[PDB]
Design a protein around this ligand. Structure first.
Ligand code: N9T
Ligand code: N9T
Ligand code: NAG
Ligand code: NAG
Ligand code: NAG
Ligand code: NAG
Lengths: 532, 532
C-alpha cells in the first residue's frame, strides 16, 4: 500500500492526510535513535534497534523536554512555539511528508527546528511539511533533537557527557535519511537541510563538521549561522556551566562521574527549573547549554575553519529578517511591553545596550552606544527603541551571518542571500516589533496558502514565490527557474555582494547588506575588546 | 592735528589714508615693547621706554622672524599670507585705524593674527583695518607677537626662556591699548579682541589666563580655540622640543643656560631652517613651538579650567568654516595637489588618517577610519577626499571649539555661534578645497567692499552683513541690532544649541553643529586612547 514502507529498520505504516482540497501521505514519529533515557541521558545517541512488525507511524511523537514559555499565557503568538505534545526524554523521532503518488527520486528537504538549543518541536503547526511537500513535489522531513541540558551539557574529556549530543541527534537523523529515504521515493543524493535560528546555526554546523558533510547535498540557513555569539561556547565555559547546574541542584561536584550521576538521578523538570541560573551574565539572546567547540565535532575553532576553507563546499541559500532583535528585547529588556509602543528612555536604552553585549567592557559599551545613537535627537524613544532592535539583530544574527557568507563564498560553489522584510498582515504581535525573528517560517512552509488563516492574496503570491525558490534551490542549487520570466535572484559574489528582497513588492536587488554596521561588529569591536 | 596723538609713551604722528572714496587716519608701527633682541631673545617682553619727540608712525613695521611658505612660488593664494615687509627680530609693534573725525569714545577692536604660532604678520592686505574702522565707526587695532621659536621656546623653570612669551607680547599690546586707546578716541572699556586660527586660540587663551582678563571686555574667536590639539604642549614636551632644536644646531645640551646661550648666538634664519625637525611625529596640523601649559600663564590644565568656570565670564562670538581641513591636506597629505581634483585612493586615505591623528595607536586609527568611511562605497576618491577634509577640520578646529563653546556657555554671559559656508566667487584655490581655513577673514575686514577686487554684489551684501554683526557685537555683546528687520541670530544655549549660517542665502538656524562627529572626538576617542 501507499502508506506502507519497508525501511532498513523495519516496516512503518503512515496515514493519508488532506492538504488544500487534495491528499498526500505522512509518516510521523519514526524512531531514528534509541530512547536516550536513564544511563543514556547526556550520552551520545545510539541507533534504533530494528523492529519486528509494523510501526504505527500515524500520530505525531512526544516533544523533547524543554523550558516552556509562559510570559504571555494564552497568547497564540507565544504559544505556537511551545510544545503541542507531551514532553518525554524519549523525543528522538522524525516525520516524513510524501507526495502521492509516491515519486521515485524527487528532491528531499530535511527541516531542523530552532529555539536557542534550549527548546523546539518538530511538531509545531508552523512546521507542517504537507503544504510544502504537496505544492513543490518534494519529500519533506523534520527531525528532532535533544535540547537544553539534555542535549548540550559539556563536561569535556568525559565520555558520559561529552557535549554536542543534540547535534549527534541531528546527525543520526540525517544518517537515517541518507540510508532510508529512497524507500519513500526520496533521492538520497539530493537532500537539502534547512533550519532557522538555532536550526540555521545547526545547518551551518553540519557544513563545518567533517563527520556530517557527506550526509547531505546542499543547505539553507534562515536567521542562523554557526558562528553566532550565542550558538557555541568554549570547553572551559561549558564545563563551568555544567558545574554550576550541579551546584543549583545540590550535587556532589568533586568528580565528573559524581556530577553526571547526580544529574541523571534528577527528574527532567528539575534541571529545567534552574537551567537559566548558570548564564555568566545579565543578558538577552544567550542560552545556557549550547554546542561546545570540542575538537571532535568541531576539529578546531570556527574562525580558523572558516578562514582555511575547512568545510563542505557546495551551494547555500541563506538570509535574514528586517527586525531580528525586537522579539528578544520584549522578553528581557526594560521598557518593552507587548501592549505599549515601547518608547525607550535614554536611560533604558543604556540598559538595553548592557544586556545585548554582555561580554563588553565599558569602552566597548560606549562604542556600541556611539555607533547606534542619533546624537542630533538623542532622547527620541522611537529612535532608541528601533536602535535597540538593530543592536540585537546585527550583533546576534545579521552580522555573524554576513561574516559567514563572506567567508563561505570565498570557497563555495554558489551562494544566494535574501532579506525578508514583509510584515505579515495577520500578525498578533505589536507593530513596533516589525518583521520578527522566525516569522518567515510561515511563508517557507506555505501557511498563506490556507485561505482560512486570513492572508492577503499578495501574501499567498509571496509564499508560493518563496516556496518555489526554496524547492527549486534544493533540487538544483539555483532558486531560479531556467528559462523563466521573473527577475533573476543574482548569485552572491565577493566582488558585487548582491542580494534580493523578499516581500509583496516587485523584487529588488541591493548590495553589501548592512555592511556599515557589520564592519563594526565583525572587525572593529573584536579588535577593541582584545586590546584591553 | 588729527594725525597727532599724545600718548603716555610719547607723541606719535600718523597718516591720512583713503578708503572707499573717503579718508580716515592710521597710526602704523607704534612700539609697545622693547625690541627683544640679543640677550632679550626668548625673554619675557619689556615695556617700551617712552620717547622724546614724535614717532613717524606712518609706515607699516617689520614683521617678526618666521618660516616663509614657498610651496607655490608666485601664487597669490599662498603669498597673501607670507610677510610683505622685511623680517626683524624687532617686530613688536601695533597699528591703529581711527575714523575721522576722531570720535571720543567708540568701540575698540583688537585683531590677533594666526598662522600656527609659527607665522603671521599684522601687515597683510587681508588684515587692513581701514575698511572695518570706516564702515562701522570702530577703532581697529592689530598687534604683532613673536612667533616660532622666538616666541614659544619652552625650557620651564628657567627665567631666560620660560615659554609663552609670544602671548606676553600679545598681553603687553593689550595693556598698551588699555592704557592709551582713549587718546585715539577709543573706549578702553569696550575692547573686543578677535582672532583666527592661532589668533582665535590666543583670544580664548586670554579668556583663561588670569593675568589677561581685565585688559579686554569681550571676545571673538574664528576657527580657533584654546584647547585645540595643536595649540599647546606640556612642559615636558616643550622642553624635549627645545632640546631637540639645540641638537639640530649642534649645541651644548648640558645645562639650560648652555642651551639658551647657544641658541642666542645663532642667527634667526638658522633656527627657522631646522624648526620643523623637532616635531615628535609625522603629522599635519602640528607646529613646533606653541604655548606651554606652565602653571603661570595657565594656572592648571586647560580642561580643569574649563570644567571649574576658571575664566573671564563675558560674551563671546565664535564659529567655523565648512571645510577647515582641506588647506592642510594640500600641504602634507599624499594624493592632494593644487592642480588636480585630488581624488584619493583607499591607500592614500589610510595614509591621511595616520598624518591627521599622529598620537593615536592602531586601534584609534581604526576607530577614526570606521567613523569616516562610507562602507557601501569605500573606493570612492571623492568620498575619501571629502572625508579627510572632515577628519582634519573636526579633530583640529570644529570639535575642540564645540567643546569650548559647550563648556564656556555653562558659565558665561552670552554666546553666539556661526557656520561660515560661502565659497568666495573669486577664490584662486581649486574648488575641491571648498570653504577654506582663514577665508572668512576677507569678509570680516570688508575686502568685498572694494569693487575692484572682483566680488559679486551679494558678497558685498554678505561682508556688510558680517562686519555689522562683528562691530555691533563688540559694541554691545549682541550682533543683532535692537529693533531690526532681519532674522535674529539666536543665542547659543546648552538646551537648544542653536547657531546660524553665514552665506549669501537667507539666514538659517540649525542646532547641535556636527555633534555626531564631535561626540566621537571629544568623548569617545580620548576614552579609547586612555584605555591602552
Ligand atoms: C534569565 O534568563 C531567561 C531568559 C529567557 C528567554 C526566553 N525566550 C527567548 O529568549 C526567545 C525570545 C524571542 C522569542 C522566542 N520564542 C519565539 C521563537 C522561537 C523559535 C524561533 C523563533 C522564535 C523566545 C524565555 O522564554 O525565557 C527566558 C527565561 C529566563 O529566565 C527564567
Ligand atoms: C615637516 O613639517 C612641515 C610642515 C609644514 C606646514 C606648512 N603650512 C601649513 O601647515 C598651513 C596649511 C594651511 C595653509 C596655511 N597658510 C594659510 C593660512 C595662514 C593663516 C591662517 C589661515 C591660513 C599653511 C608649511 O608651509 O610648511 C611646512 C613645512 C614643513 O617642513 C618643512
Ligand atoms: C558558483 C560556482 O562557483 N559554480 C561552480 C562552477 O563554476 C563549477 O563549474 C562547478 C564545478 O562542478 O562548481 C560550482
Ligand atoms: C546671556 C546671559 O546669561 N545674560 C546675562 C544676563 O541675564 C544677566 O542679567 C547679566 C547680569 O549682568 O549677565 C549676562
Ligand atoms: C495508532 O495510535 C493511535 C493513538 O492511540 C490510534 O488512535 C490509532 O488507531 C492507531 N492506529 C493503528 C493502525 O494502530
Ligand atoms: C617716515 O618714514 C618714511 C620711510 O622712510 C618716509 O618716506 C616719510 O617721509 C617719513 N615721514 C616723516 C614725517 O618723517
Amino acid at each position: 500500500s501507499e502508506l506502507l514502507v519497508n525501511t532498513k529498520s523495519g516496516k512503518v505504516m503512515g496515514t493519508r492526510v488532506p492538504v488544500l482540497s487534495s491528499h498526500i501521505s505522512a509518516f510521523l514519529g519514526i524512531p531514528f535513535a534509541e530512547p536516550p533515557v536513564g544511563n543514556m541521558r547526556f550520552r551520545r545517541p545510539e541507533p534504533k534497534k530494528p523492529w519486528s512488525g509494523v510501526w504505527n507511524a500515524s500520530t505525531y511523537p512526544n516533544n523533547c523536554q524543554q523550558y516552556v514559555d509562559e510570559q504571555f499565557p494564552g497568547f497564540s503568538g507565544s504559544e505556537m512555539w511551545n510544545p503541542n505534545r507531551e514532553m518525554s526524554e524519549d523525543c528522538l523521532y522524525l516525520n516524513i511528508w510524501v507526495p502521492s503518488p509516491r515519486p521515485k527520486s524527487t528532491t528531499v528537504m530535511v527541516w531542523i527546528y530552532g529555539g536557542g538549543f534550549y527548546s523546539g518541536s518538530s511538531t509545531l503547526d508552523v512546521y507542517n511539511g504537507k503544504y510544502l511537500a504537496y505544492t513543490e513535489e518534494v519529500v519533506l522531513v523534520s527531525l528532532s533533537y535533544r535540547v537544553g541540558a539534555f542535549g548540550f551539557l559539556a563536561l569535556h574529556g568525559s565520555q558520559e557527557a561529552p557535549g554536542n549530543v543534540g547535534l549527534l541527534d541531528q546527525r543520526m537523523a540525517l544518517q537515517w535519511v541518507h540510508d532510508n529515504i529512497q524507500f519513500f521515493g526520496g533521492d538520497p543524493k539530493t537532500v537539502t537541510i534547512f533550519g532557522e535560528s538555532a536550526g540555521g546555526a545547526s545547518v551551518g554546523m553540519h557544513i563545518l563538521s567533517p563527520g556530517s558533510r557527506d550526509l547531505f547535498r546542499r543547505a539553507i540557513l534562515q536567521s542562523g549561522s554557526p558562528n553566532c555569539p550565542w550558538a557555541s561556547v568554549s570547553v572551559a565555559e561549558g564545563r563551568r556551566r555544567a558545574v554550576e547546574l550541579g551546584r543549583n541542584l545540590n550535587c556532589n561536584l568533586n568528580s565528573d562521574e559524581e556530577l553526571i550521576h547526580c544529574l541523571r538521578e534528577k527528574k527532567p523538570q528539575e534541571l529545567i527549573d534552574v537551567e537559566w541560573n548558570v548564564l555568566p551574565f545579565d543578558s538577552i539572546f544567550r542560552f545556557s547549554f549550547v554546542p561546545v567547540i570540542d575538537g571532535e565535532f568541531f576539529p578546531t575553532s570556527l574562525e580558523s575553519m572558516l578562514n582555511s576553507g575547512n568545510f563542505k563546499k557546495t551551494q547555500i541559500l541563506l538570509g535574514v529578517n528586517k527586525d531580528e532583535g525586537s522579539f528578544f528585547l520584549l522578553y528581557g529588556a526594560p521598557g518593552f511591553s507587548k501592549d505599549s509602543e515601547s518608547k525607550i528612555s535614554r536611560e533604558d536604552f543604556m540598559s538595553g545596550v548592557k544586556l545585548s553585549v554582555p561580554h563588553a567592557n565599558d569602552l566597548g559599551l560606549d562604542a556600541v552606544t556611539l555607533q547606534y545613537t542619533d546624537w542630533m535627537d538623542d532622547n527620541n524613544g522611537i529612535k532608541n527603541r528601533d536602535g535597540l532592535d538593530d543592536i540585537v539583530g546585527d550583533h546576534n544574527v545579521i552580522c555573524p551571518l554576513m561574516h559567514f557568507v563572506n567567508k563561505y563564498t570565498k570557497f563555495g560553489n554558489g551562494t544566494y542571500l535574501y532579506f525578508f522584510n514583509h510584515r505579515a498582515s495577520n500578525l498578533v504581535w505589536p507593530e513596533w516589533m516589525g518583521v520578527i525573528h522566525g516569522y518567515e517560517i510561515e511563508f517557507v512552509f506555505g501557511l498563506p496558502l490556507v485561505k482560512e488563516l486570513n492572508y492577503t492574496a499578495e501574501e499567498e503570491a509571496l509564499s508560493r514565490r518563496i516556496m518555489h525558490y526554496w524547492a527549486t534551490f534544493a533540487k538544483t542549487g539555483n532558486p531560479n527557474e531556467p528559462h523563466s520570466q521573473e527577475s533573476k535572484w543574482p548569485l552572491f559574489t565577493t566582488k558585487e555582494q548582491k542580494f534580493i528582497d523578499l516581500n509583496t513588492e516587485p523584487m529588488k536587488v541591493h548590495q553589501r547588506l548592512r555592511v556599515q554596521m557589520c564592519v563594526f561588529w565583525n572587525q572593529f569591536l573584536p579588535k577593541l575588546l582584545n586590546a584591553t
